[PDB]
Amino acid sequence: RLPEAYVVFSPIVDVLPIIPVFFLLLAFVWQAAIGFR
Amino acid sequence: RGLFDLVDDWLKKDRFVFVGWSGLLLFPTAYLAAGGWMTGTTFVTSWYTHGLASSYLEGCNFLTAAVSTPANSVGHSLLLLWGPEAQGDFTRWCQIGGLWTFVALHGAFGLIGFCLRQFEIARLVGIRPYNAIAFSGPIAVFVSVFLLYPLGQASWFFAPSFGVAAIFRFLLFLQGFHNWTLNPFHMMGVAGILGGALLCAIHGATVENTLFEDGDAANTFRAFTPTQSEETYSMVTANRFWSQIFGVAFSNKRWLHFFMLFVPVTGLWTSSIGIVGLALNLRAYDFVSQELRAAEDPEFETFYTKNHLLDEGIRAWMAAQDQPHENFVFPEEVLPRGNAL
């Protein structure tokens, strides 16, 4: 796994590759809040 | 005025969902076919009929869940809840496979009630009834598969179960045992389904590419008010396009849109005629001139005789687990294997 000074953050790193999908959904959420205009 | 007129005026009232006279046959029977399927794929097992698992309680996902056909010992019983098999008990009715006939029968009276819905709305709006006649296509596939196919066979057991992978075995059961792809009625049905998908992909892409300029915006979806009398695409241009690309082309919008009705629906009627001929086991199994020759000449091989050896594998390997009622105990040494497989 990660080096010993970094084994603490092993849950947070598991979420990290998902985060680029969340930018695709952030566009539509932003288009909803702007009212699609 | 009378009592019939008040009821006639109430059902045909403009409301959220149009009820009409036909809604008394549709809305009770369609609600119970759909709810009988959602219940049967969630809770009711197939452990006693088929010897499978076909529920969400039993770990199956959306794909491997089904409402399954009853046992072969039931025969063609209607399996009424009050009947001689179930005798009023709900729990023993579900284990015999009573929900499957509950779905199929109340579903068959949903498709009756939905096609009557299309005659009733067309008479009130005042249009020609071609939706109700094109919907007769899908009626001829439900009836001649979910109803007329197990009636000609041994029981309801040989019918398609209402589940995603349970249709998929019915596709594989019909090749090994019936040679369904060789049947010219499927061949005229594939020509209508792939032909019907062809026509909407062309008519979709030719209308959308001969549009007129009706606005300054780059979006062309905005430039159409529904009540306008000017046509929205150049028919003369689209004819001139396909007359030079493909060589021949429609010059008639009335003939075009009728031809988009004829091609998908006829593929459901011609394929429905053949599956009635497989209830009687009148299959197009072999070309005897190919079979008499391959017997006398042990060198003559076609692709066609290659498909029979693929069907011996379907007829032998799955039929042990397919039909647990018949108790096929095959030895290892009768099952046709190939070399080193």
């Binding site: - | 059961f173 998908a197 030719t206 091989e301 498909n307 693929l310």
Partner: protein
Amino acid sequence: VSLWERFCAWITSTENRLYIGWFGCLMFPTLLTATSCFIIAFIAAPPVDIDGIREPVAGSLLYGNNIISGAVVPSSNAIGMHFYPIWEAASIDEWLYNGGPYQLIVLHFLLGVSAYMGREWELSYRLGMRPWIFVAFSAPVAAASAVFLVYPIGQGSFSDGMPLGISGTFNFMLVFQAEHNILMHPFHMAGVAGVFGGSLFSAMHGSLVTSSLIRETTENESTNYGYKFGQEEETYNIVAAHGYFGRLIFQYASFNNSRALHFFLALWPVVGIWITSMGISTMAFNLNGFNFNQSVVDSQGRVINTWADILNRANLGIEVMHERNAHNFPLDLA
């Protein structure tokens, strides 16, 4: 004035009977050679070693076939992926034995269909049309290149390519089922929804136009003669067919816009066949469909069967019987 300008003016003329164009410079020589070799190889062609085991499979009409069983046989397992033209064959008899004309037809087909597609673009440019009919034709070009080109690449041989016939098609579909489990793969699922949906919205749109036609004929003559060609009046009450489907399901599920309606007819099949043709492509490289065999167990651990286990026993029957002599080792790696 020049000879080239008087040739470019003719080859890009829309005043020809059939538009030739610059893609027709390599559409017409390709597809006429794929045609003229197909008619000869379907009618009169000797048997072909397909399995590479020197067991020649007859596929033509003169060797005792019909329309259904006759087929242009794919090339040998001995050749495999190698390019095998006529001049690299040392005789035509050695060419026709080893599956010659399958590569001549297919390679001149995929060039001619990818040029027929660009030709649909070109005439749309010279006629003033918006251009994208050729994007809708990308969906059968994706599917033709999937079973003739991409699937022989990832499996490493043209012998696994699709036989040019009718019974050869069903030899292709069943063997593809046992080795790849296409029915459980979600891209065949997304294109069965593409053509069941496609034939739905075809017959659903074609009925609502034909339902709402305007009176322009008598009851003696044909319905179709109420459309004069090139007229500017609309030939059906579109408000009528909107109020019908607005009551048949409910109000808000109906397209009042005929442009957005005629776009959804082009979206649904074409997206369904793009996705499907990238199902054969990802299953050309042995990334198969789902496999739920022995997935449901009791607490004791005994395997409880599902419908996928019954589907598996149909796949095991085709797997142990396809190419019944070509195998020598326990696993069909090819």
